[PDB]
């Protein structure tokens, strides 16, 4: 068209465009004031109904990198508050807005953002609702920079539903609190995931990516064809790229031409994709990405036919041997939804291993005609860390269970912080219970999505603080094997127990008063400590310390003399266990 803006406020909308200008220019200019961006957004604002007025009105013909940096070039404190920023605004167009990407800074040093009283947040809801979302949406923005400008409003109006359902109900906290902790955790997910995709594009490059996005979109679009699948992959791959390097508009519309391809060829994809494409706009990207598994054929062959029978496997393999093992994999991932795509990567490379010590050798055939039969052994190992892993979920409850944990992994790597070996262990927990409660079908792509980010958020904090070689191995193992090594992980023997400290065992009644939350922070912290004090205890042993202290907290936050039944009642409890514990 004549007029870019002109365009994106028509088929935006004004509440849209507002919310997204905003959210623009505060993971940009993440040092100026709110007042202040909530100026520019009406003087952009004024200017786009200026075009959809008239598409030649000055500037309107203008590209929106263009009029966008042509913006924040007008930012006076600009040199003052970001200094070497606004040396961009010298360079012409194309390099101009290569520099701001540049100058972005990801982590910037900003204070943790405090949750106030639900009361005083409703309150605040109540008499000026738009400013109060559009501050913490500007604070989230600025936050968080690389975050895809169209989900942030996403979670937007979510939270905007809350207070809205919440700020009226008789029980408000007891209402609110429960989907914050929600929305919180649920964005944070979101957040990682994504830093994490990009991650993973620059260590082990597209080839890598593409074999990850195969298995995956074959599982999802099972009826598509592979050469749609390609297609797609190939596609996609091109958005995730453009999306990483941090240009909203690129990656804006690359993911929107993507989605009406989807749209229009829906009928050659997936029956499932209905809704998705009857929705605007600025969501139908996130329906599909969100969207659900699409029946698979059932009238499907089988893989020993075209890959370990049928002779010329290794002459289709030479042929274009990546399309032949993207094949195995759109063939044996559209037929697994039920398989996490690493597992099925870990198949699909057993494979191409094979087929290199095999397609060499006199009777070809013959070697790998028992290829099968080596998946078996890849496939229940994560399969039977499911059930075992659950069934003991079930016997005790999460709390329980997340401190079995807390024992487990403490006499793996005893060398690892407290603080981390607790937290690592309720996130561990945590995914036990999400994914527990499905059934057998939709457990082990669940596990994997959360462990995922568990495993890298657990990595990152060993990147700045080693602790243990052995954490660090897997940690910089392939993707594929960053899992099963961890598993593999043995206690260990090396480790000299610490010295008793009374202190780390000397209880006041401030845990009789704490939330849930606390009293079993403070009393993991303590069992993690246990273990590191006497860690060839027994896990009878263990339970049985754990049972006398059970019961004692109880006895002393029940009883009338609280404080003189910790410190005398204590000094019995850690002089027992003292000697049972040898
Ligand atoms: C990418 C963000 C584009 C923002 C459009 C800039 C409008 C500036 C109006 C003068
Ligand atoms: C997206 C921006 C709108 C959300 C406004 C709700 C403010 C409450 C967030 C407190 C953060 C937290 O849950 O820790
Ligand atoms: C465009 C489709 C290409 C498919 C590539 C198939 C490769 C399968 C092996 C699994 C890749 C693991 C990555 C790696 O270790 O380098
Ligand atoms: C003139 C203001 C421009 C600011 C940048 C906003 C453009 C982003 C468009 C979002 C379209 C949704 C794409 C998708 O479906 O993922
Ligand atoms: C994770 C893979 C999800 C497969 C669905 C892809 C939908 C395409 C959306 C484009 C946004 C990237
Ligand atoms: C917590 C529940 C334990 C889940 C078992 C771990 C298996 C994860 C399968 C992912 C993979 O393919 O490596
Ligand atoms: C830091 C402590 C290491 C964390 C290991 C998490 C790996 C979870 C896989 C479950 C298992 O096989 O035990
Ligand atoms: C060697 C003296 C150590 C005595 C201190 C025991 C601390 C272990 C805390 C166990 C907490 C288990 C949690 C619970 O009881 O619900």
């Known amino acids: 068209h004549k007029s870019e803006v002109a365009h994106r406020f028509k088929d935006l909308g004004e509440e849209n465009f507002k919310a997204l200008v905003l959210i623009a220019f505060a993971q940009y200019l993440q040092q100026c004031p709110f007042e202040d961006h909530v100026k520019l957004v009406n003087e952009v604002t004024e200017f786009a109904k200026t075009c959809v007025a008239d598409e030649s009105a000055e500037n309107c013909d203008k590209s929106l990198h263009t009029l966008f940096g042509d913006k924040l070039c007008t930012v006076a404190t600009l040199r003052e508050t970001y200094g070497e920023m606004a040396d961009c605004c010298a360079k012409q167009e194309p390099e101009r807005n290569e520099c701001f990407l540049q100058?972005?800074?990801?982590?910037?040093?900003?204070?943790?953002?405090?949750?106030?009283?639900?009361?005083?947040?409703?309150?605040?809801?109540?008499?000026?609702?738009?400013?109060?979302?559009?501050?913490?949406?500007?604070?989230?923005?600025?936050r968080h920079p690389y975050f895809y400008?169209?989900?942030l409003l996403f979670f937007a109006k979510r939270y905007k539903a809350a207070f809205t359902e919440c700020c009226q109900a008789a029980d408000k906290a007891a209402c609110l609190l429960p989907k914050l902790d929600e929305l919180r955790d649920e964005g944070k997910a979101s957040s990682a995931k994504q830093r994490l995709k990009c991650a993973s594009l620059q260590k082990f490059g597209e080839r890598a990516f593409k074999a990850w996005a195969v298995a995956r979109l074959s599982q999802r679009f099972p009826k598509a064809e592979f050469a749609e699948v390609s297609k797609l992959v190939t596609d996609l791959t091109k958005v995730h790229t453009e999306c990483c390097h941090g240009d909203l508009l690129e990656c804006a519309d690359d993911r929107a031409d993507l989605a009406k391809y989807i749209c229009e060829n829906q009928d050659s994809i997936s029956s499932k994709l209905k809704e998705c494409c009857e929705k605007p706009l600025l969501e139908k990207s996130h329906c599909i990405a969100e969207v659900e598994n699409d029946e698979m054929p059932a009238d499907l062959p089988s893989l020993a036919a075209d890959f370990v029978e049928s002779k010329?496997?290794?002459?289709?393999?030479?042929?274009?041997?990546?399309?032949?093992?993207?094949?195995?994999?759109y063939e044996y991932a559209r037929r697994h939804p039920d398989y996490s795509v690493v597992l099925l990567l870990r198949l699909a490379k057993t494979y191409e291993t094979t087929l290199e010590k095999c397609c060499a050798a006199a009777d070809p055939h013959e070697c790998y005609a028992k290829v099968f039969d080596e998946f078996k052994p890849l496939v229940e190992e994560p399969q039977n860390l499911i059930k075992q892993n659950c069934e003991l979920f079930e016997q005790l409850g999460?709390?329980?269970?997340?401190?079995?944990?807390?024992?487990?992994?403490?006499?793996?790597?005893?060398?690892?912080?407290?603080?981390?070996?607790?937290?690592?262990?309720?996130?561990?927990?945590?995914?036990?219970?999400?994914?527990?409660?499905?059934?057998?079908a939709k457990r082990m792509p669940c596990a994997e999505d959360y462990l995922s980010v568990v495993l890298n958020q657990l990595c990152v904090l060993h990147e700045?603080?080693?602790?243990?070689?052995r954490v660090t191995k897997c940690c910089t193992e392939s993707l594929v094997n960053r899992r099963p090594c961890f598993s593999a992980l043995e206690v260990d023997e090396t480790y000299v127990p610490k010295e008793f400290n009374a202190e780390t065992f000397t209880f006041h009644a401030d845990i009789c008063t704490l939330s849930e939350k606390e009293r079993q922070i403070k009393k993991q912290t303590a069992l993690v400590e246990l273990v590191k004090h006497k860690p060839k205890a027994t896990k009878e042993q263990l339970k049985a310390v754990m049972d006398d202290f059970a019961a004692f907290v109880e006895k002393c936050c029940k009883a009338d003399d609280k404080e003189t039944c910790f410190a005398e009642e204590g000094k019995k409890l850690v002089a027992a266990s003292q000697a049972a514990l040898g």
């Open 312 to 329: 010329d496997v290794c002459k289709n393999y030479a042929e274009a041997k990546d399309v032949f093992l993207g094949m195995f994999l």
């Open 464 to 469: 700045k603080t080693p602790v243990s070689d």
């Open 103 to 142: 100058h972005k800074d990801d982590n910037p040093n900003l204070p943790r953002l405090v949750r106030p009283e639900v009361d005083v947040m409703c309150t605040a809801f109540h008499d000026n609702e738009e400013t109060f979302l559009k501050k913490y949406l500007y604070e989230i923005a600025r």
């Open 149 to 151: 400008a169209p989900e």
């Open 398 to 440: 999460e709390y329980k269970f997340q401190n079995a944990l807390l024992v487990r992994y403490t006499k793996k790597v005893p060398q690892v912080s407290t603080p981390t070996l607790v937290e690592v262990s309720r996130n561990l927990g945590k995914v036990g219970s999400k994914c527990c409660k499905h059934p057998e």
